[PDB]
């Protein structure tokens, strides 16, 4: 297998970094270029409706159709069924994450209706709220441990636990007397510019969230801005933390090609791209 596969045997994986970063990093710059047009012919109607555009933090990320989460609809409105969204496959499910924009304001309501329709247990949140002074994402989460709603769901804070590179809060959901446990994994650390460095602070908050939730059956939210890059990045290196456990080849490859076709621009950057191999290369290494 070899358009949409480039499986590498995992105790020849040093030699393939090494290989792919040669010269400038030619081969992995390569590689990330051929898939450049994965999954871009397919059809994002309702993303571009008139009513939906108010939804969207960019034009040009748009969820396709065939793969968008569905909100319940309301029946006097046009797009209540919308949300910047898209089941994208893991480990475990292809339907194993719901990856999504930063919540605007104007759609936080909308984002915890679909936490709570996905019957979700978890969000991952890679970004913070501002970045070079930038809003990148809207604090759809309460400050305190006053409950607060948003539409017919019911937040509050019980518990958080703040380290190094990252915050873990739980919450209670609520929507009329059914009642949950959500908890929500958010990175601080990124960096404004390029990727995390050193590579291993990424790996630390991808241990902890596995180990922490373990195998889920319930969609797990994944957002940072635009909901592509640094979500596909941590699909992916959680993807493959996962895979070493169980086999002797990795396709780091083959998991962003797969990404591609269910969501626009899943792993963004070249450099994103080579810092999943970087974080699995200290894996192999024990750092």
């Known amino acids: 297998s070899h358009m949409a596969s480039r499986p590498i045997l995992i105790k020849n994986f040093a030699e393939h970094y090494r290989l792919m970063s040669a010269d400038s990093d030619f081969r992995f710059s390569e590689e990330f270029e051929e898939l450049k047009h994965v999954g871009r012919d397919q059809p994002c109607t309702f993303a571009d409706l008139p009513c939906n555009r108010p939804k969207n933090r960019f034009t040009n990320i748009l969820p396709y159709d065939h793969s968008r ?5 309301v029946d006097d409105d046009e797009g209540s069924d919308y949300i910047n969204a898209n089941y994208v496959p893991g480990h475990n499910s292809p339907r194993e994450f719901i990856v999504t924009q930063g919540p605007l304001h104007s759609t936080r309501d909308d984002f915890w ?39 017919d769901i019911k937040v509050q804070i019980l518990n958080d636990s703040h380290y190094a590179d990252w915050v873990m809060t739980e919450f209670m959901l609520c929507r009329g007397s059914e009642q949950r446990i959500l908890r929500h994994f958010h990175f601080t650390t990124w960096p404004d510019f390029g990727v995390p460095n050193p590579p291993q602070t990424l790996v630390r908050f991808v241990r902890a969230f596995r180990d922490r939730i373990g195998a889920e059956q319930r969609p797990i939210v994944v957002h940072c801005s635009a909901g592509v890059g640094r979500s596909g990045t941590f699909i992916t290196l959680d993807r493959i ?7 002797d080849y990795v396709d780091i490859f083959g998991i962003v090609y797969a990404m591609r076709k269910e969501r626009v621009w899943m792993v963004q950057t070249e450099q994103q791209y080579i810092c999943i191999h970087q974080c699995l290369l200290a894996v192999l290494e024990g750092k």
């Open 69 to 73: 989460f569905k909100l319940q609809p």
């Open 241 to 247: 933390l996962q895979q070493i456990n169980t086999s």
């Open 113 to 151: 209706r679909m936490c709570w329709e996905s019957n979700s247990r978890a969000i991952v949140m890679l970004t913070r709220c501002f970045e070079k002074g930038r809003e990148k994402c809207d604090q759809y989460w309460p400050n305190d441990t006053v409950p607060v709603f948003y539409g």
